[PDB]
Amino acid sequence: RLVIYEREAPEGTVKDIKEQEVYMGEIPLMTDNGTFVINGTERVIVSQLH
Amino acid sequence: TPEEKLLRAIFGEKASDVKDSSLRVPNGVSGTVIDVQVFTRDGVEKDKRA
Amino acid sequence: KFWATVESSEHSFEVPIYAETLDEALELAEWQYVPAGFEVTRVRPCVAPK
Amino acid sequence: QSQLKLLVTRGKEQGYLTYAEVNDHLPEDIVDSDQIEDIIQMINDMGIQVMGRTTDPVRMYMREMGTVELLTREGEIDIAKRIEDGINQVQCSVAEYPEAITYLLEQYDRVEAEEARLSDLITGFVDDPELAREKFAELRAQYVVTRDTIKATAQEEILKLSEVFKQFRLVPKQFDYLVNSMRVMMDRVRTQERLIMKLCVEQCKMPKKNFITLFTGNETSDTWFNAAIAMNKPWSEKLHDVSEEVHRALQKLQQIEEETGLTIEQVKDINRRMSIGEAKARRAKKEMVEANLRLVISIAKKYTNRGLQFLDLIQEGNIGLMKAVDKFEYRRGYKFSTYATWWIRQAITRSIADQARTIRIPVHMIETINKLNRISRQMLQEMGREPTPEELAERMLMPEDKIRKVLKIAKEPISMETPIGDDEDSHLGDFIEDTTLELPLDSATTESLRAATHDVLAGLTAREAKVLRMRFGIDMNTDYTLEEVGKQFDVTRERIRQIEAKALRKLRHPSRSEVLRSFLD
């Protein structure tokens, strides 16, 4: 939601656009087996220890 | 070269304008083909096998 | 000159200290060694039969 | 108040130092090998490390320009005034040189004679071919009126000559050549002057006090030579020995008074005046640039990551600023800031367009790529993934098939030393195969084939072998034309062409042909 506040507050908005669900990226999904697929290949992300 | 030109002249063999880059089975491995896939660029006409 | 035996850290070694007296050699050794956190163990005069 | 403790303290607080820093500060008694090499072990046991002027010129330049005082609104007018006073002085110095006018007239004689163009001789005068053809005749007229006044009335016309010559805006190259010609002429004058001088003071034994006395104002005549040596002076009678050389070399000295149309007295004055003007000019202009050095940096901070270093940007931009100072006129009222800004920015952009690439591409190529880069932005999330490779240039004003090539060459080459997988010493270029190399197997087969073909050629007749070798490059340089073969073979033409076909047939049968047959793989 992009809100443009009217100059010299109290802050109302002159206008605000709700523009619909802007697509940013796709994200990898984990298989029911706890694995991903990066390219055509099952991938595993090892849990770290720090 | 000169000797090659003599060879071409005697045996009358057209030297192709095209080199053979074909994918051939690696030396020593003998399998059986269980599948084939053809990926074509979008906008390029598909071949017969594809 | 005079060989001053300095020992610190994991190991020891001897360093040349020039001076006109054994006592002076010791003072010049310490003044030029101790304050760095280096221990001064020994002071020996240079022999060298000639 | 310890040297060692100071060394170790720096090497403790910081913790971490380099060999050189340790070598800088060492005990008064330690200069030698085992006395350091062990001290390192001492130090590398605790606080372990081994390996004003900050160097990097980003600082030093910033400070050195940080010294220069910023100008004032009025000060700019002062400096520009100094500029105007400076330049036009050398312009007048040019206008007062006869050869400078005559050269222009002659070159224009070459223009109307179709031996050269107008663009090389002029940029226009105060402003058309006809108007040029006339104005030039005006110049020529004011020349031909002053040419006959060489007889106290001439100083009046020389003014107007200067006036009409000044009305010409010369091509910078030509003007440069004129100035060069003048100064070179002066260097010749100095050649003769010094030659004559060294034959008196440096050889003939005579003071420069007395030498310049009768020298100034004549130098051409014998008033100081033939009327001098008899004066009964200690340096007088000594002048007989070299009296030949000076008198022989004087001819060119008085010849310059002809070629240039000016006495030796006047030449030096004119050229010196020009030098004064030029020096004055550059003296003001530099001072103009140094004040505006900050603007360049402020602009260059925008162009940083485009593939050129900061200092490269600020230097090219500095060149732009120099151009701005060269082409600026305060009389136009245009603010020098907002003016020079565009120049600096132009130099920067134009330079980045060039030297930021391993493979340098033309400007219109860079622009054309830029437009595609911009178009690919809007359709990015608009198409849900990204616009198809064959949909970009539709909005562009070109055949649209360029997108491939344009997208291909544009990509910069990858560093050959780029670390590849395994994170080892393995690098990309280490895996680059040599294709241009001829594999040893083939190189052996070639030798074997040479020997083979030689053997097969040893089987034919002497003339068949000779002509078949001659038709090709076999065991010879530069395979010969079928006519040339005959020329060396006596009987010529269709004769030779037959033997060829007669040879090939004899070598066609699977007896002689079977040996090299297998080479046909």
Side-chain angles (χ1 to χ4, degrees), chain D residues 10 56 93 157 177 244 257 277 306 331 353 394 416 428 451 454:
Chain D
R10 209 64 184 159
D56 63 305
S93 296
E157 294 182 351
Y177 164 69
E244 226 277 305
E257 292 185 329
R306 215 147 315 279
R331 305 166 69 260
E394 314 147 325
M416 190 149 47
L428 191 62
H454 169 55

Side-chain angles (χ1 to χ4, degrees), chain B residues 7-26:
Chain B
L7 195 65
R8 295 291 181 267
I10 293 184
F11 275 72
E13 202 170 56
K14 292 184 178 61
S16 196
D17 280 326
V18 67
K19 176 185 170 59
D20 171 43
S21 45
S22 62
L23 165 65
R24 42 190 67 255
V25 191

Side-chain angles (χ1 to χ4, degrees), chain D residues 377-391:
Chain D
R377 166 209 279 96
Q378 309 182 33
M379 344 297 294
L380 210 156
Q381 70 282 38
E382 187 219 49
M383 296 293 297
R385 187 192 73 260
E386 62 163 338
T388 52
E390 204 49 53
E391 163 245 326

Side-chain angles (χ1 to χ4, degrees), chain D residues 435-490:
Chain D
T435 49
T436 64
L437 228 191
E438 186 183 33
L439 50 151
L441 212 166
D442 279 324
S443 185
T445 62
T446 303
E447 183 183 75
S448 181
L449 193 267
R450 284 188 175 187
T453 54
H454 169 55
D455 298 341
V456 182
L457 291 186
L460 294 169
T461 79
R463 56 169 178 173
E464 278 183 333
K466 191 66 149 54
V467 72
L468 196 47
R469 288 180 199 272
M470 192 155 301
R471 188 62 205 136
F472 301 132
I474 296 290
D475 302 336
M476 272 181 301
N477 28 253
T478 194
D479 65 317
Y480 308 87
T481 66
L482 48 151
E483 292 75 17
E484 175 68 30
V485 175
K487 172 137 66 272
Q488 297 301 319
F489 239 51
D490 221 88

